[model samples]
Target: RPKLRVVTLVEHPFVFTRESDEDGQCPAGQLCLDPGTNDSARLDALFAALVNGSVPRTLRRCCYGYCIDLLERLAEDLAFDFELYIVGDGKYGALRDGRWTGLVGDLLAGRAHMAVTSFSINSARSQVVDFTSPFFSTSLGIMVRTRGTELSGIHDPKLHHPSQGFRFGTVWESSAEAYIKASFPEMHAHMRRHSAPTTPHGVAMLTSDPPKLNAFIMDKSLLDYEVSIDADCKLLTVGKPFAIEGYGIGLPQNSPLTSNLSEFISRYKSSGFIDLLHDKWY
Candidate 1:
């Protein structure tokens, strides 16, 4: 079987990694990689150096998450060996200077065979890369501390506290940021000034003592998952979701893998396999 270079990014409950005790000693059936690998190298040296045709040794990193599980199932059913690596740039796809960046860029540039994570399926991206049928759907939403008074909406005056000025932000280089930029230019600027680089960072700021942000906006599904596991339960989701979208796997433009991948995803959705993965993660 041909080995594939699969690209992914770290996103909670989707794709994440943890260092292992010894080289290649990952728990049985789990995916592991050489910790010394570089995601953007022209040719991944560690992947080429691999032995046993699998698993690296000496302090490896193991992957686990909803998407990882999906990838595992897809690979098994498709009968392919894969080498998963984190994306060189820690971003979702975004257009910059007539070129795409992040996972989409990696796929376009042939850095990897497939891209996964909480990759949203949007028109701009679709024009450049083929996306599998969305495995999950989501929409923009606001997450805030359990406030004294409920917010009227995402743009409520209270959100821009009189003393603190605008106290809301969202993950940069994301569909959420893109929508805010297009629909609410001024709010977009405010968020640019206080934006978090990633979803986890935004959530941390919202949950930290003396919360840095009064409200953090991003995917409602992700926010719901975060709130569910928050032991403190000091957070609350406010307002309704908007700008509905779906999360899908990304492949190179017109890649041969698209048909099988999409078919499996469609089957997974209809068979409740996707929901089961969501139930496990969230």
Candidate 2:
């Protein structure tokens, strides 16, 4: 069979360039591009394409750092030749239904195999494509600027203290919104409701200005990424995960490869390969 070639967008930290020593050194028995230093060949190629502008340079849906690492491991395990295509426009704008709609729709309709992204599994998206078993489980949390205790009053009394007012923000159509609504129905009644910004980075903007909208709700991984890169943002788990969910790869509905993909995932789970992959990326 022809090698499977897949495309993915470029999100830094999740997929970016890293320096390697001149000496080609790879861990014992692993392929080495240098004599004494380890190299990321897959990342090298993706970065090359990104730098040369050979591929479409667009922001993707999710900025999780592990998306490409997981794909690389999957390709190695499956022994399939894959290419990560950077498609769509800006990651946030991609979700707006103009470029992503045409780009993702064409890929699904065309000869391309499947798309593996940090796409959340939801009823709205399920209508368009089939998703594999979730590889990662996550929930939403609120991010606040380091000195914004005054605005922390938004949290539910059941979940947070009543004296603290944490001004909160989240995307309009996010699982966080859904989870919040279901988890603290009464709290939703008292807070001054502001819709979450459209993109993950937008949350930073909300937190950038303290005392007004000091807090924003986001996925745990994304919040971690932000806190790791920026010292100003502090993420807090206000409530237990209101909604328990997992992330899955999207494929054409009823694709012939569904069973094979599921089996592949199951094997990864049993072999502890998935955990190893998690350590490498997360």
Candidate 3:
């Protein structure tokens, strides 16, 4: 059967793929995936589109974890198959210079049918498009080195040096920067100097900089997943997650698919499938 086309961004566990040999799940000794679906009968099932700020697993990967699990279940309930795509000029699919861009851009230009990554619902994007029910609720969080406090504590009201102070970042235009401003005690000057915008982009910037990031506010689950996999790095959570944000599937504005997808979301939640994936991935 033809696979459904899905575009996304890659980061971590949410959507990733690895070459493997014969195993329990992959008896064929190839790509092993656990897209948390109800389709137990794998070989004889429908194939459809896919998502991610994702990697190894593939943007061609989650809302990085909790949301990804939700997608897996949505496919099962909808009884359709899809593949993941992580292509665009910007990392998290941003709209710049008048033309819509990024993962959502693929949808804007009809490159793919849907975007399954943890793209949030905002007024700017909402004005031009529609969104499905929230797969997961989330907010901005600071992902920092385990010793981030010593690097640049958030409480440093009178921060002196840039390198020695808190260096925060997030996906550009993403709610991360928006909420951080309203929640914090005006750390604009500090954060303004370094806001990566894209989750993976921020992570990369954090890893590359010295003394590491003091606190990069991002989605709760996404940051947690990164630390969980990094056995060597001392990256850790910096502060309590702030704001009341949610994650939703992005679709073309006023598209008829909203109700169709919403129905699937309602079913999976009722069946407790959503909770199951959340436990495993988040």
Best by TM-score: 1
In lDDT terms, how accurate is model 1? Answer: 0.79
Off by over 4 Å in 3: 1-4, 19-72, 148-166, 178-193, 197-201, 204-209
TM-score of each prediction: 0.89, 0.62, 0.69
TM-score of 1: 0.89
lDDT of 2 by residue, 1-282 (tens): 345544343333343423222332222221111111112354355445544744221211222246666665666766666543333332211233342342245345442466655555655456666778877777666566554333323344423433455455565445555555566775544332655444355455555544445556656666666666665446443444434566676676787766667777778778887788667765
Model 1, position 112, has a per-residue lDDT of: 84
Clash counts per candidate, in order, are 2, 25, 39
Which rank order by lDDT, best down to worst? 1, 3, 2
Worst 10 residues of 2 by lDDT: 29-38
lDDT of 3 by residue, 55-147 (tens): 233211112354445656666666766654344443444456886666556677766567776677766667777788876677656676664
lDDT of each: 0.79, 0.50, 0.58
Tell me how candidate 3 scores on lDDT.
0.58
Against the true structure, candidate 2 has what lDDT? Answer: 0.50
Best prediction by lDDT: 1
Tell me the tens digit of each residue's lDDT in model 1 across 46-129.
565565255445535678899999998999889988877776567886888888887888899888899878999888889889
